[PDB]
Amino acid sequence: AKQSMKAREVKRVALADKYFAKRAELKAIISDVNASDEDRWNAVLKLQTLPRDSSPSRQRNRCRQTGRPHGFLRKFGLSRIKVREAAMRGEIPGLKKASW
Amino acid sequence: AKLHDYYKDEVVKKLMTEFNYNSVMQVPRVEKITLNMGVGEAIADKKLLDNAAADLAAISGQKPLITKARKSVAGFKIRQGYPIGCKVTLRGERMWEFFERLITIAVPRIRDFRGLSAKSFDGRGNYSMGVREQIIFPEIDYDKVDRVRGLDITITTTAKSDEEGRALLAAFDFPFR
Amino acid sequence: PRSLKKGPFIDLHLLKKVEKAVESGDKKPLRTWSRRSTIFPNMIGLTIAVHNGRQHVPVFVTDEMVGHKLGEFAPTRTYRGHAA
Amino acid sequence: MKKDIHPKYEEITASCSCGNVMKIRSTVGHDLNLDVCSKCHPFFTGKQRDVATGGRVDRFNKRFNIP
Amino acid sequence: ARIAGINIPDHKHAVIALTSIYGVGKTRSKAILAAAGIAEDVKISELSEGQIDTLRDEVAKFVVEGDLRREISMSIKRLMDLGCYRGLRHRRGLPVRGQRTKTNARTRKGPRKPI
RNA sequence: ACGACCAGGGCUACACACGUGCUACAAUGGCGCAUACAAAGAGAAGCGACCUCGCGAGAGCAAGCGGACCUCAUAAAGUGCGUCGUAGUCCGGAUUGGAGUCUGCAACUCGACUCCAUGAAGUCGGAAUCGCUAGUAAUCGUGGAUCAGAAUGCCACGGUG
RNA sequence: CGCGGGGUGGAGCAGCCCGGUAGCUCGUCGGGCUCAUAACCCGAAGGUCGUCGGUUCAAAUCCGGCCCCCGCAACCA
RNA sequence: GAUGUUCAAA
Ligand SMILES: [Mg+2]
Ligand SMILES: [Mg+2]
Ligand SMILES: [Mg+2]
Ligand SMILES: [Mg+2]
Ligand SMILES: [Mg+2]
Ligand SMILES: [Mg+2]
Ligand SMILES: [Zn+2]
Numbered sequence: 001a002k003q004s005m006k007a008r009e010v011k012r013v014a015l016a017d018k019y020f021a022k023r024a025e026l027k028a029i030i031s032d033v034n035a036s037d038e039d040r041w042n043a044v045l046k047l048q049t050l051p052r053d054s055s056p057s058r059q060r061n062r063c064r065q066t067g068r069p070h071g072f073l074r075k076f077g078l079s080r081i082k083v084r085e086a087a088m089r090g091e092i093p094g095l096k097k098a099s100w
Numbered sequence: 101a102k103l104h105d106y107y108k109d110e111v112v113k114k115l116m117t118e119f120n121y122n123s124v125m126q127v128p129r130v131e132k133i134t135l136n137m138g139v140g141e142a143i144a145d146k147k148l149l150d151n152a153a154a155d156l157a158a159i160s161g162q163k164p165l166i167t168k169a170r171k172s173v174a175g176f177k178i179r180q181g182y183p184i185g186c187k188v189t190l191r192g193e194r195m196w197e198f199f200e201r202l203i204t205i206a207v208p209r210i211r212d213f214r215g216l217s218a219k220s221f222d223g224r225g226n227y228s229m230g231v232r233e234q235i236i237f238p239e240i241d242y243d244k245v246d247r248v249r250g251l252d253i254t255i256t257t258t259a260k261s262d263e264e265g266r267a268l269l270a271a272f273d274f275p276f277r
Numbered sequence: 278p279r280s281l282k283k284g285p286f287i288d289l290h291l292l293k294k295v296e297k298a299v300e301s302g303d304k305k306p307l308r309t310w311s312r313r314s315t316i317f318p319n320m321i322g323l324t325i326a327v328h329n330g331r332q333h334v335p336v337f338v339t340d341e342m343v344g345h346k347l348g349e350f351a352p353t354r355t356y357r358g359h360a361a
Numbered sequence: 362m363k364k365d366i367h368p369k370y371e372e373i374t375a376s377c378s379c380g381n382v383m384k385i386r387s388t389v390g391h392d393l394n395l396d397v398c399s400k401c402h403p404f405f406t407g408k409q410r411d412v413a414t415g416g417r418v419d420r421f422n423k424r425f426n427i428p
Numbered sequence: 429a430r431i432a433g434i435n436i437p438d439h440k441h442a443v444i445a446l447t448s449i450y451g452v453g454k455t456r457s458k459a460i461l462a463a464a465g466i467a468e469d470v471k472i473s474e475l476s477e478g479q480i481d482t483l484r485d486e487v488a489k490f491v492v493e494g495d496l497r498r499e500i501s502m503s504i505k506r507l508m509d510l511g512c513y514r515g516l517r518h519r520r521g522l523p524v525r526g527q528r529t530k531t532n533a534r535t536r537k538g539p540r541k542p543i
Numbered sequence: 544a545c546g547a548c549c550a551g552g553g554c555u556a557c558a559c560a561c562g563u564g565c566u567a568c569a570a571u572g573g574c575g576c577a578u579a580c581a582a583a584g585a586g587a588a589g590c591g592a593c594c595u596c597g598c599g600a601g602a603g604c605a606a607g608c609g610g611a612c613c614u615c616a617u618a619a620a621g622u623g624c625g626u627c628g629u630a631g632u633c634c635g636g637a638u639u640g641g642a643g644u645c646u647g648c649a650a651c652u653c654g655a656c657u658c659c660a661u662g663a664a665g666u667c668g669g670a671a672u673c674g675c676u677a678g679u680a681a682u683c684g685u686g687g688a689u690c691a692g693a694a695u696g697c698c699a700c701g702g703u704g
Numbered sequence: 705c706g707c708g709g710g711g712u713g714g715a716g717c718a719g720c721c722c723g724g725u726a727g728c729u730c731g732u733c734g735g736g737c738u739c740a741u742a743a744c745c746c747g748a749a750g751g752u753c754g755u756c757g758g759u760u761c762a763a764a765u766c767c768g769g770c771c772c773c774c775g776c777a778a779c780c781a
Numbered sequence: 782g783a784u785g786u787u788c789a790a791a
Contacts, residue, residue, distance in 0.1 A: 001546085001547090004546080004547065004548090007547090008548090020588080021588095025588095031282075031283055032282065032283075032602095033603095034282065034602085034603085037426075038428065040282075040283075040284070041284055041427055044283070044284070044648085045289055047648060048288060048289050048648060048649085049289060050648080052648060052649095054648095055647080055648065055691085056588075056691070057646095057647060057648090057691050057692085061689090061690090070689095071689095072689085073688080073689090074688095074689095074690095100699095102384075102385075157368050157388075158368070158388055161367055161368055161370040161386075161388055162362065162367060163363070163366040163367050163368070194370075197385070197386045197387075200385070201385050201387065203399055204383055204385070204398055204399045205375070205383075205385075205395060205398065205399075207399070207402075207404075208397040208398060208399060208401075208402040208405070209395075209397065211337070212324075212337050213402075213404050215404065238375070238387070238389060238393055238395065239387055239388055239389060243505055273399075273405075275404055275405060278642095278643075278644085278650075279649080279650085280643090280644070280645070280646095281424060281425070281643075281644090282602090284425050284426075284427065285421075285425045285427075286648090286649060288649090310550055310551050311550095311551090312551070312552090312651060312652080313648090313649055313650090313651075314649095315651095318412065318418045318421065318422065321412060321418070322403070322410070322411075322412070327551095327651090328550085328551050328552085329551080329552075330551055330552030330553075331551095331552085333551095336511075339510075340416045340417060340418045341417060341506055341509075341510060342510065343417065343418045343421045344417060344420075344421045345510070345512060345651080346651040346652095347651080348551095348651035348652065349512050349513055349514065349651040349652080350510065350511050350512045350513070350651085351513075351651075351652085352513075352652095353513065353551095353552065353553090353651075353652040353653095354552085354553080354556055354652075355556090356556055356557070358558080359557065359558040359559080360558070440627095441626080441627080441633080443633085444627085444633060447633080450660090450661085451660065451661090452660085453659070453660055453661085454633080455598085455658090455659075455660095456659070456660075468626095492660095496640090496660075496661090499640080499641080500639085500640055500641095500661090503640055503641075504639090504640080507640095512651085513651065513652065514651090518639090522557085523638085524638090524639065524640095525638090525639085526555075526651095526652075526653060526654095527555090527638095528555060528556095528557090529555090529556065529557045530555080530556075530557055530559095531557090531560095533557085534637090534663095534664080535637050535638050535639095535663060535664075536637095536638070536639095537557090537558090540558095540559075540560095541558060541559085542558080542559085542733070542734085542748090542749085543558055543559060543733090
């Protein structure tokens, strides 16, 4: 069922890009600001009317090659096992076994 | 006798007009209000029956009467002559004092209310109702009683018909559905 | 706890249905899956059946209930006892 | 009535949040103060529901203002 | 020594005696001594039960002893009547904050009980 | 339909046992004050100083930094001072009530932290059993990854020894 | 009927005489040791002693009543 | 220094 989870993750990054920069920041700040009153209440209402998948917290970091939820490292964008094999094939630049 | 003085001043003439009686005596009245508690755990814990009796003694001033079982029954594991229930019959001014108290305080104090069944009459004009929680009466202090039991209130009335009985209680402004 | 600045939390569908019932008088229970919504004074004296995974469980709102969440009263798991 | 066996029964004055005061003969022995009476009850043809009365509901309102 | 509260504080360091008093913590002890101005670095001489007279009135502004206990009782009885999950843990002697019951919940459940 | 899209719940339930940790059982210690040092590492949907307010967790304002420069974030036992004077204790912290902060659409189940109050067990642990031969155990702090938020774990680092 | 003995943890057996607050054996339950099992080890629970009175600061203990079992002897309305 | 049975063919 890995493909279905990936199909969802591509929808979540698409919708978040669609909505994060258009309304997410403004609705949060006009709710947070102390000077704003009454409108901060209305702002929360329209926020819940949104799809809710836009939230960046709905996104879960996953390897591109093997779509694996756990073991993901941001810098390589790969799961731990994928990073190890790629490093030995020389695919990852500057990555060597570490001794100290 | 707060609800009594009201009855003989306003209720009597109210029922008199809408029924076209020939005599004031014909107008129905409330004879007695028996309050009944039943403890099926009396055989298990005789102390619980005493506590229930103490609750009824608080609810109504008259001291409670312990009802022994009428006949031995196999299903309920009871034997004849064994104390099982607790009953008080109120017939005097104390009947009116309980009646005015029940409508003014106990019925509002019930948690969720949707009306009292007008249909719940014995068919001889005598209204019988059931109380789910004894704590509704303010007599017993809340959280000062072991368990929340219940009681059964019966309004024996002179009325020979349910229709006469409902109007008598309705005239008192009883909370019918 | 939600921050005081953000105010109380309520769901649009829940609040809209509550206002739709109050204007038309109490008549039927509001069946909702919103356990996150806070108990509000506007919905006191009404039976809101907050959803429990298997089936909604009816709750009658009271004054002491306000200041607590709808789900907080509702059962969320069944564990009668370890013994049969 | 038989002497001694019956609980003591004197008159008490029970007050209400709505302001209605009822003189009732009861065995409480103390003047308790109640919240709901027949007059302030929605079913007893109440015009104003108990929602108007304060309590911890008002305390919730002071903390969260939705005007 | 005695204080406005029902319980009697011990004769020793004043701050410690107040910590022992129910309802008054060490930090609250420092709060009222800041108002009273009585420090332990003053002359130990001329110390009498008469001196705590100022303590009697200032502590009375804080619910303590029986007053706090009444508040705790009303808070828990409400929980029981509410039908809320918080009240139910109180009734069953189980953790009321969400701590794991599987293990390490001895303080709430009590001594170990055989199957 | 052993496919898939959703909302709520569960993986945190709990008579109970075990494994591995943490915090203790104090006085070589607790509390209060004064004062001293690290090394390693991370940062742009990010580190965020300073300043103002809040007991505080924090909020606002906003410098700088793609980094030997700015920012976390400066250490802790240590030393010097006073008190406790051996008591379930100025030990120890569970637990619980009340209130607030922050993340996040939202903290009810089911986050962390702060404050106010509460002060359980524990006065060093049965049979038995584990780790370690030198900067090693022992002890005391610091950072990282994972990460919206969520360490007592984990990968590193230094301190005393 | 007389004399003597016995009844104590689930079971069994001490303790009794000579009153000092009640144990053991085996079983049970939990843990340990062992690759595993037994043995073994540790911890735990269990009756205040057939019952009822008396005595006394105090009773399994001492003296009686009663119940059941057993041994031997006794028994010509 | 107690006890620990067995195992079709390719
Ligand atoms: Mg595949
Ligand atoms: Mg996530
Ligand atoms: Mg879902
Ligand atoms: Mg798990
Ligand atoms: Mg110690
Ligand atoms: Mg984090
Ligand atoms: Zn009223």
